[PDB]
């Protein structure tokens, strides 16, 4: 199964809240590449520790640009990019 | 230039209103193929006179399925599919 790429939880100390993202925001693209579902967001974020990514986001009928500075979480094999959203 | 695929006008006697579409609806896909912008909607509708097409549409945060029965308008070279929306 797959889910729409809509934010339902935010880490108050994480990158997504710092970037101005909000519950209910729907991610449309990351660095110009459409995101088809939430798992695509997870996979792309995890692969990009420490990287700035450019989002297009839909919020209440308006398409917005958002710059998101991914953090780093985990150790060894598990070290991954982190956005602070679910 | 391009525009998001959002309905801003509807023919009260046309297929889109009959299908249950509403101002502000955002078309996401036609027959499972993403629509990137409004011109893609125009081109796909015009090419499909008389055809039923399956839409995914975003309305106020909810993804909806909509079956749209395209009509026919125009004569000769200009004969085209018609959805009744702008
Ligand atoms: C998006 C995913 C990788 C994770 N839930 C995070 O906050 O980064
Ligand atoms: C979508 C386009 C082809 C036209 N405005 C129509 O109503 O069909
Ligand atoms: Na969606
Ligand atoms: Na950020
Ligand atoms: Na990954
Ligand atoms: Na929206
Ligand atoms: Na941006
Ligand atoms: Na859009
Ligand atoms: Na119809
Ligand atoms: Na066409
Ligand atoms: Na919406
Ligand atoms: Na449908």
DSSP classification of residue B49: T
Closest CA to A32 of A51, A48, A55: A55
> At which residue do the structure tokens 């994480």 appear?
A14
* C-alpha–C-alpha distance, residues A45 and A19, integer Å: 14
* C-alpha–C-alpha distance, residues B73 and B58, integer Å: 27
Find the B73 Cα to ligand 2 centroid distance in Å: 10
What was the experiment behind these coordinates? X-ray
Domain A15-82 has CATH 1.25.40.340: no
- In this complex, the residue of B6, B26, B34 whose CB is nearest that of residue A34 is B34
Contact between A26 and A4 under an 8 Å Cβ cutoff? The reply is yes
Are B6 and A63 an interchain contact pair (Cβ–Cβ within 8 Å)?
no
Q: Look up residue A50 and give its two tokens.
A: 């420490």
> At which residue do the structure tokens 């695509």 appear?
A40
What is the stated resolution of the deposited model, in angstroms?
A: 1.2
| Ligand 2 lined by B53 (C-beta under 6 Å) | no
Contact between B69 and B18 under an 8 Å Cβ cutoff? The reply is yes
Find the A39 Cα to ligand 5 centroid distance in Å: 10
């Amino acid at each position: 199964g797959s889910l729409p790429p809509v934010l339902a939880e935010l880490d108050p100390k994480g990158p997504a809240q710092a970037a101005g993202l909000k519950l209910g925001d729907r991610l449309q693209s990351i660095d110009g590449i459409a995101v088809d579902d939430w798992q695509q967001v997870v996979d792309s974020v995890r692969a990009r520790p420490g990287q700035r990514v450019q989002l297009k986001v839909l919020r209440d009928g308006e398409v917005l640009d958002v710059a998101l500075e991914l953090a780093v979480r985990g150790e060894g094999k598990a070290r991954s990019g982190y956005m602070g959203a679910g």
